[PDB]
Amino acid sequence: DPFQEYQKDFAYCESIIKKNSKSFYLAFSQLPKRKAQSVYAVYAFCRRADDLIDRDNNQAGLRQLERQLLDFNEGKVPNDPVWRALSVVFDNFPMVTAPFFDMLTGQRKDADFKQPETRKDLEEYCYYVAGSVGLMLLPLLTERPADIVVPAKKLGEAMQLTNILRDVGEDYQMGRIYLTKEDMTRFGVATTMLKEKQAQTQLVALWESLAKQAENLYEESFEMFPLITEDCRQALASAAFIYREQLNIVRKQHYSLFDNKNKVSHYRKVQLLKEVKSYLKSY
Ligand SMILES: CC(C)=CCC/C(C)=C/CC/C(C)=C/CSP(=O)(O)OP(=O)(O)O
Numbered sequence: 085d086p087f088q089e090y091q092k093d094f095a096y097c098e099s100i101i102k103k104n105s106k107s108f109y110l111a112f113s114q115l116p117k118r119k120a121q122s123v124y125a126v127y128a129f130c131r132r133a134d135d136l137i138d139r140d141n142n143q144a145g146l147r148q149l150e151r152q153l154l155d156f157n158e159g160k161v162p163n164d165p166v167w168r169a170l171s172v173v174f175d176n177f178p179m180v181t182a183p184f185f186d187m188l189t190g191q192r193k194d195a196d197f198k199q200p201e202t203r204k205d206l207e208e209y210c211y212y213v214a215g216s217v218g219l220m221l222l223p224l225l226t227e228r229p230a231d232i233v234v235p236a237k238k239l240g241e242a243m244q245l246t247n248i249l250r251d252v253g254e255d256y257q258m259g260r261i262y263l264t265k266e267d268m269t270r271f272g273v274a275t276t277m278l279k280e281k282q283a284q285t286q287l288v289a290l291w292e293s294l295a296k297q298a299e300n301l302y303e304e305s306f307e308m309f310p311l312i313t314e315d316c317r318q319a320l321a322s323a324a325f326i327y328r329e330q331l332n333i334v335r336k337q338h339y340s341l342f343d344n345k346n347k348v349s350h351y352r353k354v355q356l357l358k359e360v361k362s363y364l365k366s367y
């Protein structure tokens with residue numbers, strides 16, 4: 085039983101998601117155990133690639149990670165907890181390495197940050213760092229991932245846009261602007277507005293424009309539900325509804341640009357799980 089054989093490796097991954105994403109841990113913990121542990125392994129790989137760049141600015145770390153993935157792709161499993169847990173997942177489900185490579189390519193681009201010029205640019209980037217994650221997970225969630233790659237990529241995009249909209253102030257502080265040059269021009273936002281406590285009128289317009297796009301993408305992605313394995317629906321919809329709720333938080337705090345993380349209460353998460361359970365009955 086490979087989940088017993090590699091139980092410490094899966095425990096290693098579980099602890100990583102538990103400590104880093106209370107939201108995705110709560111949402112995905114509703115999966116049957118082996119599928120949930122498989123998600124945690126994938127989370128671990130993602131979290132490691134991202135922390136390397138965003139926290140550590142360690143391009144040499146990200147190179148090592150790329151070399152391990154190339155080996156893994158060849159069939160030579162790196163002797164490393166995350167890679168050993170991933171080998172079990174790849175043994176058990178029709179996982180594919182392509183979106184894992186896409187994630188590293190997106191991370192590497194963040195290592196030399198440029199503001200997107202267009203929404204097209206921003207949309208390609210959201211694929212590499214977020215839509216790819218949907219593709220990593222699909223084989224855990226549906227009998228044929230190819231059937232629903234489009235809506236899966238949309239949910240990853242909706243989430244990444246939500247992350248962007250949540251973190252405008254902290255990002256700018258760090259030297260990053262994800263909002264598009266074209267949007268800033270269209271809505272008459274000056275980058276100076278990005279360091280204030282509450283969004284000015286122009287930035288609220290832009291914020292809401294992008295939030296509407298995210299909200300549309302969430303809704304569009306929900307088209308995949310009928311092809312999602314029944315026992316996986318509550319967990320996946322939970323992840324979506326919990327993440328989407330952060331848009332309403334920023335609105336309720338009157339478009340605060342800072343301190344928007346960890347603002348969805350446990351109470352509100354529980355409410356959302358029940359909403360999700362009601363919502364799914366309509367499939
Ligand atoms: C498998 C699964 C359910 C989830 C994997 C999610 C992860 C960790 C993906 C790595 C890259 C991303 C999208 C990081 C968060 S956006 P950010 O880097 O701007 O924000 P942050 O400050 O790191 O939260």
Ligand SMILES: CC(C)=CCC/C(C)=C/CC/C(C)=C/CSP(=O)(O)OP(=O)(O)O
Pocket residue numbers: 104105108213214215217218219221222236237239240243244247320345
């Ligand atoms: C499953 C599927 C078909 C589509 C969804 C794909 C997923 C899960 C994309 C992850 C995107 C993001 C922004 C994750 C935040 S990771 P975090 O741990 O840093 O939490 P935080 O950034 O702090 O919100």
Ligand SMILES: [Mg+2]
Pocket residue numbers: 134138194
């Ligand atoms: Mg990042």
Ligand SMILES: [Mg+2]
Pocket residue numbers: 134135138139
């Ligand atoms: Mg990060």
Ligand SMILES: [Mg+2]
Pocket residue numbers: 247248251
């Ligand atoms: Mg971010």
